[PDB]
Design a protein around this nucleic acid. Structure first.
Lengths: 171, 128, 237, 82
DNA sequence: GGCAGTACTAGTATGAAAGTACTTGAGCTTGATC
């Protein structure tokens, strides 16, 4: 799910950045440090929408860096268990389903695939299909999954999905 | 302990607003135009790029005005930000499917009513 | 102390060795323990365990008395079919906390319920109720579950229960080849439960009793604390 | 507080001038722009001491009054004791 | 040749401070009852 929230940051500026372009450097430093990052509390920071206020810089004692508190609006992506989202299938394997939900990866265990969807290695591009060949899931297909659980390992979040409920799967 | 299928979210996500993939795409397009023009700024991150194509690839209302009208349409219905945003993104076509995917919707409206909102969405859908 | 359980002898060269209670003496004086000997066959005497080579001890001689596979030697040590079978005082052994290793099992019920876990009723008119553990006893647990939509506490014996778990909750492996590993259970089968580990996505299939509900994140360190997953090791020079 | 009604000594207490020449010299010592023309100076403490007599140091001192309030004095507004 | 007893070794188990503060006991005064 996508959200619009207000977040904070402390920008530690190396002493070289001082001088004329000081306030501008803080904004440019902020954009580079938060965009693309991910955390467990808020998730993936997609982009900074607006910078509300810049706090007065406070010299940190014993270190050169001076810390400017910063208030900004950002777009974040935070998945939840039970939510259905659209993903793009990126790779077919005999071990399961490798998917991708926006910037976050999601793995759909083969055990969570209806029994009608046999795995077929001999097909030209690997894929997942029903013995009836009616429904075939392969690279670049759009599917609906239910996030069953989330994990955060080294600031990066990944999820596990399932296709057991009705109206899930190929789109 | 937490579960969106029961609208149990953390305290922090209370004052927040949900965004449709269509709205997200628009916002990212404007930030990009700014990043594009006015040089002396490194190219955007991979997370962005991946999100820029993914969001676009699933955007159903390519027009600015349309998106706003859809949002307002649902706006005048007693819906929680999560339930609202989820129906707009997934655009189910029948009351049955809708309730299955979003169990929190159970008992909120009559299937007929749920189908009216669904039918209205479908009508607003910018088909390709 | 139970027959065929494993205890550890307090003294001798056999000190701390895992040994199986071959025979509990009714008098409650001694117990026969099944051991593997740590002997030099009196060749070195003017060591690691090794199965009793009756032929070797006969070759070396000394205090040896063979009686079939049963052989009495040096100090009336009894051996039979390669193992030792000698009585030791109960006072002389450690009767609790021992637990054999898998390797010791090769050489020679239970209930684990903790307050806070979700359990299911396996039988009775109360079957398929799931709820969380309030309290616990050793046999008839008188597990006092709080079932979904039930404000009352019931009582169940351990034998009537099992550790249930919907897919997506975190689980820990309490005992087994995998014990200490954690994961989210993707699919539940009859008594079968499959899950993916947190350390690696390598699959795991375990029994319903071997999992518990614990919200803690994976440790990432082996038993013994010396090594951890993903570390560089020297295999040979 | 307001720029009016500030009640504090205009002079720079020897505790403030000790932590200003320290904090400034730590900045200069890491690639920081120098306000004053430096002539044969490789030592940061001598440079930061020189910026002070010329009143070029870019620091504002926040003085907490004992009742919880505070005042912000820039290093130019204060009067150097020595 | 085997069993029992005794001795030795190893391991395990336990005068010449001063002062202040707090508590307890005893005594005195006041109130209530006969």
């Amino acid at each position: 799910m996508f959200y619009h929230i207000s977040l904070e940051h402390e920008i530690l500026l190396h002493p070289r950045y001082f001088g004329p372009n000081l306030l501008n450097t803080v904004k440019q430093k902020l954009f580079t440090e938060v965009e693309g990052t991910c955390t467990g509390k808020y998730g993936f920071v997609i982009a900074v929408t607006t910078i509300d206020n810049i706090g007065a810089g406070v010299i940190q004692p014993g270190r050169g860096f001076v810390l400017y508190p910063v208030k900004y609006k950002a777009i974040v992506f935070r998945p939840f268990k039970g939510e259905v989202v659209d993903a793009v299938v990126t790779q077919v394997n005999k071990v399961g389903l490798f998917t991708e939900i926006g910037p976050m990866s999601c793995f759909i265990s083969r055990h969570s695939i209806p029994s009608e969807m046999e795995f077929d290695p001999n097909s030209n591009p690997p894929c997942y299909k029903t013995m009836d060949e009616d429904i075939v899931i392969q690279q670049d297909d759009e599917i609906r999954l239910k996030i069953v659980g989330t994990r955060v390992d080294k600031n990066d979040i990944f999820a596990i999905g399932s296709l057991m409920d009705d109206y899930l799967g190929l789109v | 302990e937490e579960d969106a299928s029961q609208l149990i979210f953390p305290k922090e996500f209370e004052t927040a607003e949900t965004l449709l993939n269509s709205e997200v795409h628009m916002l990212l397009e404007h930030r990009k135009q700014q990043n594009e023009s006015a040089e002396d700024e490194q190219e955007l991150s991979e997370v962005f790029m991946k999100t820029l194509n993914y969001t676009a690839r699933f955007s159903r209302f390519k027009n600015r005005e349309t998106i706003a009208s859809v949002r307002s349409l649902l706006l005048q219905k007693k819906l929680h930000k999560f339930e609202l945003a989820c129906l707009a993104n997934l655009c189910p076509e029948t009351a049955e499917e809708s309730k299955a995917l979003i169990p929190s919707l159970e008992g909120r409206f009559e299937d007929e009513e749920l189908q009216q909102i669904l039918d209205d969405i479908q009508t607003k859908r910018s088909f390709q | 102390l139970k027959p065929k359980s494993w205890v550890r002898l307090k003294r001798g060269i056999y000190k701390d060795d895992i040994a199986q209670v071959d025979y509990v003496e009714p008098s409650q004086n001694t117990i026969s323990l099944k051991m593997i000997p740590r002997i030099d066959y009196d060749r070195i005497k003017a060591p690691p365990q090794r199965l009793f080579d009756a032929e070797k001890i006969r070759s070396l001689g000394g205090d040896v008395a063979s009686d079939g596979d049963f052989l009495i030697f040096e100090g009336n040590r009894y051996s039979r079919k390669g193992f030792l079978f000698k009585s030791f005082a109960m006072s002389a052994v450690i009767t609790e906390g021992v637990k054999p290793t898998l390797s010791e099992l090769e050489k020679f019920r239970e209930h684990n319920f903790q307050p806070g876990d979700n359990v299911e009723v396996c039988e009775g008119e109360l079957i398929n109720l799931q709820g969380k553990i309030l309290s616990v006893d050793g046999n008839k647990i008188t597990i006092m579950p709080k079932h979904e939509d039930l404000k009352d506490m019931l009582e169940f014996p351990a034998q009537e229960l099992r550790k249930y778990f919907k897919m997506g909750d975190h689980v820990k492996v309490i005992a087994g080849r995998f014990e200490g590993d954690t994961g989210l259970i993707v699919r539940v089968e009859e008594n079968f439960v499959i899950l993916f580990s947190d350390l690696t996505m390598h699959e795991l299939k375990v029994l319903p009793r071997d999992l518990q509900l614990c919200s803690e994140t994976a440790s990432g360190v082996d038993v013994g604390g010396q090594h951890e997953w993903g570390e560089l090791v020297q295999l040979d020079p | 507080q307001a720029n009016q009604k500030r009640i504090t000594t205009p002079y720079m207490t020897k505790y403030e001038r000790a932590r200003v020449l320290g904090t400034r010299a730590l900045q200069i010592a890491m690639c920081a722009p120098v306000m004053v023309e430096l002539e044969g100076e490789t030592d940061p403490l001598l440079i930061a001491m020189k910026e002070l007599k010329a009143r070029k140091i870019p620091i504002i001192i926040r003085r907490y009054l004992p009742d919880g309030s505070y005042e912000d004095w820039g290093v130019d507004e204060l009067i150097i004791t020595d």
